[PDB]
Amino acid sequence: REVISIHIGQAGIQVGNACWELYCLEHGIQPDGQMPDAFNTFFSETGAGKHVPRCIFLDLEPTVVDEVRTGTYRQLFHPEQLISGKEDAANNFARGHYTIGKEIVDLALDRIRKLADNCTGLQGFLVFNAVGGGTGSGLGSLLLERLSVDYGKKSKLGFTVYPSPQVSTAVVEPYNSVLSTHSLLEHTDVAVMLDNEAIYDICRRSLDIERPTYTNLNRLIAQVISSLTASLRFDGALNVDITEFQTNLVPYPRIHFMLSSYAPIISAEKAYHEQLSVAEITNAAFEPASMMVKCDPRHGKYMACCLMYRGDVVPKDVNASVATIKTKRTIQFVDWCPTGFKCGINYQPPTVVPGGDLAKVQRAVCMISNSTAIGEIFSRLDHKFDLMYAKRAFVHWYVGEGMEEGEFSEAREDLAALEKDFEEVGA
Amino acid sequence: REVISIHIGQAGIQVGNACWELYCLEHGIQPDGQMPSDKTIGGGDDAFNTFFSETGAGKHVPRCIFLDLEPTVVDEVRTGTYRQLFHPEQLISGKEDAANNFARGHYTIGKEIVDLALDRIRKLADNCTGLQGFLVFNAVGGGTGSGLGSLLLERLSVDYGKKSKLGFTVYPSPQVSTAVVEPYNSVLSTHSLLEHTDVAVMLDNEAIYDICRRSLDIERPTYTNLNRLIAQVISSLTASLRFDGALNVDITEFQTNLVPYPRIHFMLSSYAPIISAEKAYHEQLSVAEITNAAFEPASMMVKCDPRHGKYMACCLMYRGDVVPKDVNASVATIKTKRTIQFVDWCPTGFKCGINYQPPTVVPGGDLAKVQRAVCMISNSTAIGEIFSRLDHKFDLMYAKRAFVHWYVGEGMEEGEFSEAREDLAALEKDFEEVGA
Amino acid sequence: MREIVHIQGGQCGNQIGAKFWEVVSDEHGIDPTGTYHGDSDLQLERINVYFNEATGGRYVPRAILMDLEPGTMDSVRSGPYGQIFRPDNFVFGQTGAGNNWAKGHYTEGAELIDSVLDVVRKEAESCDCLQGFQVCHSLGGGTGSGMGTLLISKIREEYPDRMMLTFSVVPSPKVSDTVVEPYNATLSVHQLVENADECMVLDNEALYDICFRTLKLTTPTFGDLNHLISAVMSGITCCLRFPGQLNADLRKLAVNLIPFPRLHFFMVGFTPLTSRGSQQYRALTVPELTQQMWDAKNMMCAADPRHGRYLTASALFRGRMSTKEVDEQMLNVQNKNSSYFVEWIPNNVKSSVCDIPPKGLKMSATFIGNSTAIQEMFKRVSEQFTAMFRRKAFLHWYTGEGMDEMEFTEAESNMNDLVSEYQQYQ
Amino acid sequence: MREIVHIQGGQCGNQIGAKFWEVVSDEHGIDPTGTYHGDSDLQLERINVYFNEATGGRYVPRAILMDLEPGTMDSVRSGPYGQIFRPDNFVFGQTGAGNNWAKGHYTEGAELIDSVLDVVRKEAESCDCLQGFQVCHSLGGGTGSGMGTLLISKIREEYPDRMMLTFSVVPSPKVSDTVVEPYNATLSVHQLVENADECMVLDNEALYDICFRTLKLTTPTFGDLNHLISAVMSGITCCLRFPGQLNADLRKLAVNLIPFPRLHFFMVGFTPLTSRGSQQYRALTVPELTQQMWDAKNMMCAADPRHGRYLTASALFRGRMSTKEVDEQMLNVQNKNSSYFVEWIPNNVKSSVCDIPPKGLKMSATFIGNSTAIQEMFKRVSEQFTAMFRRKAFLHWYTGEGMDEMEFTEAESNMNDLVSEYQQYQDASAEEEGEF
Amino acid sequence: SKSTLSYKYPAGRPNPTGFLKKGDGEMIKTKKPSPPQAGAYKRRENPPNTAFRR
Amino acid sequence: SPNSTGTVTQYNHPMFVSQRLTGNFTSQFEMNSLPSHKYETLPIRSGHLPGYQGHVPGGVGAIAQRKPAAAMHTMTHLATSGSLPKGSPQTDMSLVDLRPEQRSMAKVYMYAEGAKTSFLKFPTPKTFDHRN
Ligand SMILES: Nc1nc2c(ncn2[C@@H]2O[C@H](COP(=O)(O)OP(=O)(O)OP(=O)(O)O)[C@@H](O)[C@H]2O)c(=O)[nH]1
Ligand SMILES: Nc1nc2c(ncn2[C@@H]2O[C@H](COP(=O)(O)OP(=O)(O)OP(=O)(O)O)[C@@H](O)[C@H]2O)c(=O)[nH]1
Ligand SMILES: Nc1nc2c(ncn2[C@@H]2O[C@H](COP(=O)(O)OP(=O)(O)O)[C@@H](O)[C@H]2O)c(=O)[nH]1
Ligand SMILES: Nc1nc2c(ncn2[C@@H]2O[C@H](COP(=O)(O)OP(=O)(O)O)[C@@H](O)[C@H]2O)c(=O)[nH]1
Ligand SMILES: [Mg+2]
Ligand SMILES: [Mg+2]
């Protein structure tokens, strides 16, 4: 029961940068690598008195990688496990996919092979990347292709970061996003979206941080991935493995785009005035004000939903709450599926990082659903791709790197087919 | 079970001085020559007796003779750290060099010094009781290591005959080299290293450079960091003589299990894990892991690709926390791969060997304290190319008769150059005939 | 690891570069004698980008100072921070250019450019991974424009894949130094549209405007103008030199700003710049930085951006700040001004954050807006050039040297069709 | 042990020798008074290679000074480190050669060479194992050229199997310094091609070039020229006086440089030379060494290797360095500029590393390249010789002293054949069919 | 070239007759020495000046 | 706190090499504990990781040591370079590789890089003389 986690790009490293802080804190591992079996899914016990993680930070710019090499966790990782090139990809899909990827990907995947060979009960991979950049999207795509031809039958959970509808820190990311999805369709198995506008609104509304930085985003994302991998780590009344996600959430092999959510995101003081029970956190996990992707599922129809529960929850009232939800009329389920829930319970309450902004709560919920509001997201990105492509803007960069107009037109029509598929299935 | 080692030339002494630095650390013998009062690190009151000879009371002197013609390097040993250790009559030294001239060291300058050595090596092999053999060290580039290094061997063949004579050569690299005549010295020596040595072990300097740069992450290396991880290979293929093992292997086993035909004795070394202290304790190395890492072309002590040829018979020395269950568990997998293949008429294949003593580290050195290690020694038709590359650039010069006027001036004639070349051309067909 | 090779041409280039290396050396904590004396070890980790270790903490700049007369470099070396430049990097001319583009490009470049190419080639292959070159020169002078231009042509001919930034000061008719300002500017822009990768336009009008409206100085000597250009240059390459939350390297910036290969003339602005009498009545928040950034009184070009449309824009922030306020501020200033931003590009603003502000400041920012109002400056240059060229003023000091008139006519055609396509995209 | 007997001839020879004895005496740590004042145990160990320790604790060089006028004797006695010489090795005539090879080789030679040879014989039998005779002279004058040549021939016929270095300056191409320059140089080189073992060629013109462009000296005196030549000689013979990771003595360098018995005219460069300004800013690394070492504008000769293919090359580095870096720089310079190296010799570059640098410097290097572009010098000198000889200018000054015209004709023809042989071994190919 | 050990040809001189046209900026983006002869096997001349002829 | 080798000779080691001696240059080993911080046989807390691509002030100083040991030694060199004379030599006995020949520290192996000489110092215009 071991899952190795690769991180691609500037956002991937910083997300995993908070993830591994959380993991060392949940298993009490000192930053120099030793404790003062449950951890076996993440930290391999090497030699004696040493636990090295099953991850690879890989990037093309050396700035953040060697910031890790200088930081507090020098002694935690390998020295050889933090891959880093010499020059960036510069928000350029073709540059990251055909020029520099061709030299960095071979060392990368010939490192993951002996990580997988060290493993014995590999559950699957999970990838962290943002499609807005060049390293995250470009060699991210290239790596996922070569993983699919190497292992194939193993799961590849993808926690991607799409561009928000209006928030954006680049210009060409629509080109990068569309070129990225043409491989994100048929190479990742279970793809969980994570916009940034939604997490900004959560941090402003719930945690009442008036000045949130990327660290707070990374910290609560780490809470989500830790909450859905705690089914493997910590023991509960009724828990699932990685193979249950693709079994109960993917009705068709091309419809895998999961809205994520979490509850309760609550500060220290708002907690005093609010009761945190199973009823309201299961209700509040379905309000669009507590999802991690900006889309309105009131316009969509739920296809399948999964609910990870942590803490002190016995199945009587979690069965009651999912019963009330099924009777509600605000949200609708698809005709194609009458019983659309998959509950899972875990004993360990979610931990807290000292200095974090989250309260120490005794019970939490990590909801991962499927809808057609994703069918709204792809169109909202399709429009602002077609604006720029109608004038042939920024194209000469990708063509100079070695691509052509064919990949633009065919990746655009791939998104069109995906849209047609979502409007068909939603009926 | 006592074996004495002769070091021949600038490379022989430099290498040897790291080899003997190591053994004095393996058996707790301080450089002053004797073990300490307290701190009996070692068990076994006999272990040292195969390299050292305890003389009188509390003094272990080596069984070795540094020999050379230039007094410039031997006299670094006479006054180095081990002034005490090496007794005076083993540091043989001449007065004028062979000067990269095989003929000069084999006919003119060798003759007056060879008698002094062969009279000394005698009364070393007499203090001995159960002489297993000799193991010689030299480089086939220079004159001293090539000229009398060949003359010494031949005369050792007459006086003893059947006693094994291990050959650890340092061949010229394909392109990264320091001499010009070294194609001539390499051919003229091998022709005589062919019919007198019992096992020869190839070693190229460059293929050892690539290891230190890549594995040991040493950006700028030097001859010490090369001579250091050579003793780690000598230490390992002899630890079965010194310390107890679950499945030991003696010197007379190498010859029997690796030499299919009387002239095909050239071995492809390797070693694993070659890892620095910083990655040593982060990456667990299992008995099945390091044995994988000991078969890649990227970890050979010689720059030849074992994919161009078929392995004939491999040899595997393990040390440390190793149980014979896993040894046979891994060797299974290696035979199942399709990237490496044995010759048709060798279905058996390997010969393993396990020793309990973990490798030792040399302070100020480069390696780390390792749980368990391997010292692979193979025998492949991959060298069949090495002599061909070394042949091509020999004949490239000989067609103009360049540099030749030096060799015939010292006592040779144009016969030796020919008769040595058609020897090497015949040896190539031998590696071809076998590989059919 | 990524290396910026600095190149200074001419008088303005040498004096701008003098203040530039003074500011950069201060940011990296190296004292004027050449030894490191910083406090945090953040500074050591990224001085290869700008310095080469000589002997025992001796770091020397990676700069090449060129001109046709050692008159400016004598004052450069005589001043403070003079011993840091390596004596081999200086290059010499005995004749002198004299505002004559032909003298700077055909007669003296013909024997000067081989030696400086040797110096640049040596300094460029000493390092391992080039990031690109960075040039400071003028467009009015002779040895700045002419020599600098031929160097751009030669370098882009030899090392075509590496980046290249050009800080060029352009002429204005009101701040009109030379009389052949149009003859030099027109030929220089004609070369820069075909050789340079991106050009950041400077000019002394907007620099005086900044020093009198914002800074409200009394006597703004050229040292202060050269400092403003210096603070801009440092702010551009900040993200290479310090760790950031969202890094932006030179190539990253060029690909986010240049939509079409000919549209690479940017107008720059720096913030915060407030008088010492008003540093009491203000605060320092991201809104205070953005309000001052997008103000047209804080540009460094003589082209009002609200006479046209912003094609794209970029903002490099420095200091510990909140990316939420950064993003919502860029989004607000884009939604509120719906007429100054082009329609067929959504989210016209690229943003990036770095975590080390300049010494003594809490928070800073630098702006690079590829607008379409830059063609107004090209019109006020092109129309002057026609006014003189119609009647052959000053033309013979060029024609009698080897240059043909077709170079002038062609320079006018590229200037004219380039402003035609700027006007098309607006 | 190994020994170098030093000989200085003529005015140029004696001034170069004064400077050379100063740098060496300071390298080995003795003050101008002759007494020892060193700090180095490694200094004493090999001083016998140059010094005979006289009783009373005073080291005197093993040098013999010769000329035909007492002016240079007084000059070499005068300067600092001048009274360190034994006043019995100051052998000198009294007439003067008068820039006349005939007077130097037939009349005053046959009168002074006897006492000179008595001194040399005594000095050579003093020490045990002679490595070689070193001879520093010029090729323009009479007593440096003719007398030095007579001495070389006598020494060869006496000690037929010892090394012989000849450091010779040759007439500059663009500006001469004697009207009978070609008449002298032709006969001199005709004898050197038969007797000397290796001749290192210098030139005052190239020395001026170097001191004016690289050193950027305003006004270089003769002091600085002799300084550079002395640094070069110290470099070429350091490896005998100091122990290194890889050693190379005189005979080894000869064997590795000289492929054919007539090709022993080298060209020389030394590194690093840098003005005191840039010395503050440059870093001393093997790249910085090799870049200046391979530069054609750095050779201390009038031969420009852009006109010929390097036959072979040798590089003696001093200071503690990475052999990997050394060899990789050699490989790169050999592989990039591949057309400028001879074809039928693979790996044309010999390298060596001595562990002690010249004092004050961290690291240095010396280059000795045997190139076929050295034929330029002989072609120019021979055409000038024939231009003069066809009309018999200045010929009587030699003819009316014993020499015939057959001597001049034979010398010109031998030089004219040496150049043709250079041409052949430059333009020869490996495949051997393409050139016809 | 001290920078790269390769010998290199010097850059061609810029000529005024050949200037920079409109599009050559894009031609750029799309964009070895030897010892001369030292001829040893060529025929050396011989004029008819032989003493026999005379 | 520099190491003190028990060896004694006629001369003293130059201050620029005696001021910076490591634990490796002893006459007598500690046979008991070879893996320790004394001999840099354990991972160095100081010293960058093998992958670190930042700028370390050594660069070319060390010649045959691993990255962490090289960085440790060069940092200690620059650290105690203060007490030395101003134009001190640039190399050090720790940076240079440790040869088995010379660990005993018998002789004076490293002195030339700092001796006062007049070897390759050509005359300055002020000091220039024609040897009248
Ligand atoms: N949630 C989150 N997103 C981040 C973080 N850092 C960067 N991003 C996102 O990353 C996107 C751009 O890609 P980057 O990761 O910054 O850069 P890249 O993917 O490595 O591509 P290159 O810059 O060319 O190397 C931006 O839209 C940001 O929203 C972070 O810490 N948290
Ligand atoms: N592995 C290793 N090889 C060395 C070392 N030193 C020299 N060599 C090799 O030795 C060859 C030259 O011969 P040397 O050993 O130096 O000298 P020699 O063999 O005694 O010959 P002579 O010097 O002429 O007497 C070179 O090609 C090197 O490859 C060393 O320290 N380690
Ligand atoms: N900002 C700034 N501009 C300068 C400086 N020196 C000159 N200039 C401007 O540069 C132009 C003249 O440049 P010039 O000296 O002729 O260039 P050159 O002769 O080719 O080196 C004029 O427009 C000046 O305003 C300076 O030190 N700072
Ligand atoms: N390097 C050097 N060359 C010198 C010196 N004095 C004379 N020469 C050279 O010697 C040549 C003249 O030969 P000469 O000295 O008369 O030889 P001699 O008469 O045998 O001593 C000229 O080409 C000078 O360049 C000197 O001090 N240094
Ligand atoms: Mg990135
Ligand atoms: Mg030798």
PDB file of N, CA, C and O in Angstrom, chain D residues 74-91:
ATOM      1  N   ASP D  74      83.981  39.395 -16.745  1.00  0.00           N
ATOM      2  CA  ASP D  74      83.791  40.422 -15.732  1.00  0.00           C
ATOM      3  C   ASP D  74      82.312  40.684 -15.498  1.00  0.00           C
ATOM      4  O   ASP D  74      81.873  40.854 -14.355  1.00  0.00           O
ATOM      5  N   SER D  75      81.529  40.708 -16.573  1.00  0.00           N
ATOM      6  CA  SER D  75      80.103  40.982 -16.444  1.00  0.00           C
ATOM      7  C   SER D  75      79.421  39.932 -15.580  1.00  0.00           C
ATOM      8  O   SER D  75      78.663  40.262 -14.662  1.00  0.00           O
ATOM      9  N   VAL D  76      79.693  38.655 -15.848  1.00  0.00           N
ATOM     10  CA  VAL D  76      79.041  37.595 -15.095  1.00  0.00           C
ATOM     11  C   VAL D  76      79.577  37.496 -13.677  1.00  0.00           C
ATOM     12  O   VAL D  76      78.869  37.010 -12.790  1.00  0.00           O
ATOM     13  N   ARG D  77      80.809  37.935 -13.426  1.00  0.00           N
ATOM     14  CA  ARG D  77      81.259  38.033 -12.042  1.00  0.00           C
ATOM     15  C   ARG D  77      80.558  39.163 -11.308  1.00  0.00           C
ATOM     16  O   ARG D  77      80.345  39.078 -10.096  1.00  0.00           O
ATOM     17  N   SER D  78      80.218  40.234 -12.020  1.00  0.00           N
ATOM     18  CA  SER D  78      79.772  41.451 -11.354  1.00  0.00           C
ATOM     19  C   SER D  78      78.410  41.275 -10.697  1.00  0.00           C
ATOM     20  O   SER D  78      78.276  41.422  -9.478  1.00  0.00           O
ATOM     21  N   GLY D  79      77.387  40.973 -11.490  1.00  0.00           N
ATOM     22  CA  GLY D  79      76.012  41.070 -11.055  1.00  0.00           C
ATOM     23  C   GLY D  79      75.682  40.245  -9.830  1.00  0.00           C
ATOM     24  O   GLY D  79      76.481  39.427  -9.370  1.00  0.00           O
ATOM     25  N   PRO D  80      74.489  40.450  -9.274  1.00  0.00           N
ATOM     26  CA  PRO D  80      74.063  39.626  -8.142  1.00  0.00           C
ATOM     27  C   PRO D  80      74.039  38.164  -8.545  1.00  0.00           C
ATOM     28  O   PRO D  80      73.849  37.829  -9.715  1.00  0.00           O
ATOM     29  N   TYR D  81      74.243  37.292  -7.562  1.00  0.00           N
ATOM     30  CA  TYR D  81      74.370  35.864  -7.825  1.00  0.00           C
ATOM     31  C   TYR D  81      75.472  35.609  -8.844  1.00  0.00           C
ATOM     32  O   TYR D  81      75.355  34.748  -9.714  1.00  0.00           O
ATOM     33  N   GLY D  82      76.542  36.386  -8.754  1.00  0.00           N
ATOM     34  CA  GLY D  82      77.621  36.258  -9.710  1.00  0.00           C
ATOM     35  C   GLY D  82      78.845  35.644  -9.082  1.00  0.00           C
ATOM     36  O   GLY D  82      79.616  34.941  -9.735  1.00  0.00           O
ATOM     37  N   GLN D  83      79.032  35.915  -7.806  1.00  0.00           N
ATOM     38  CA  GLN D  83      80.116  35.351  -7.026  1.00  0.00           C
ATOM     39  C   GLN D  83      79.765  33.999  -6.449  1.00  0.00           C
ATOM     40  O   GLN D  83      80.467  33.512  -5.558  1.00  0.00           O
ATOM     41  N   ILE D  84      78.677  33.390  -6.922  1.00  0.00           N
ATOM     42  CA  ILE D  84      78.364  32.015  -6.559  1.00  0.00           C
ATOM     43  C   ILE D  84      79.069  31.015  -7.452  1.00  0.00           C
ATOM     44  O   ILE D  84      79.033  29.812  -7.165  1.00  0.00           O
ATOM     45  N   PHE D  85      79.712  31.468  -8.517  1.00  0.00           N
ATOM     46  CA  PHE D  85      80.374  30.581  -9.456  1.00  0.00           C
ATOM     47  C   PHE D  85      81.793  30.276  -9.004  1.00  0.00           C
ATOM     48  O   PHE D  85      82.482  31.125  -8.437  1.00  0.00           O
ATOM     49  N   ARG D  86      82.230  29.059  -9.273  1.00  0.00           N
ATOM     50  CA  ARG D  86      83.598  28.679  -8.970  1.00  0.00           C
ATOM     51  C   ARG D  86      84.534  29.339  -9.971  1.00  0.00           C
ATOM     52  O   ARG D  86      84.383  29.124 -11.176  1.00  0.00           O
ATOM     53  N   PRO D  87      85.512  30.128  -9.524  1.00  0.00           N
ATOM     54  CA  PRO D  87      86.332  30.900 -10.465  1.00  0.00           C
ATOM     55  C   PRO D  87      87.259  30.068 -11.328  1.00  0.00           C
ATOM     56  O   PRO D  87      88.055  30.645 -12.073  1.00  0.00           O
ATOM     57  N   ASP D  88      87.205  28.745 -11.259  1.00  0.00           N
ATOM     58  CA  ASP D  88      88.038  27.922 -12.121  1.00  0.00           C
ATOM     59  C   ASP D  88      87.315  27.455 -13.370  1.00  0.00           C
ATOM     60  O   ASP D  88      87.973  27.022 -14.320  1.00  0.00           O
ATOM     61  N   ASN D  89      85.990  27.527 -13.389  1.00  0.00           N
ATOM     62  CA  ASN D  89      85.215  27.157 -14.563  1.00  0.00           C
ATOM     63  C   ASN D  89      85.011  28.320 -15.517  1.00  0.00           C
ATOM     64  O   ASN D  89      84.243  28.190 -16.477  1.00  0.00           O
ATOM     65  N   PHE D  90      85.676  29.447 -15.263  1.00  0.00           N
ATOM     66  CA  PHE D  90      85.628  30.627 -16.121  1.00  0.00           C
ATOM     67  C   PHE D  90      86.725  30.523 -17.174  1.00  0.00           C
ATOM     68  O   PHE D  90      87.760  31.186 -17.107  1.00  0.00           O
ATOM     69  N   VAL D  91      86.509  29.664 -18.156  1.00  0.00           N
ATOM     70  CA  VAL D  91      87.550  29.464 -19.149  1.00  0.00           C
ATOM     71  C   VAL D  91      87.299  30.410 -20.312  1.00  0.00           C
ATOM     72  O   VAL D  91      86.167  30.545 -20.786  1.00  0.00           O
TER      73      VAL D  91
END
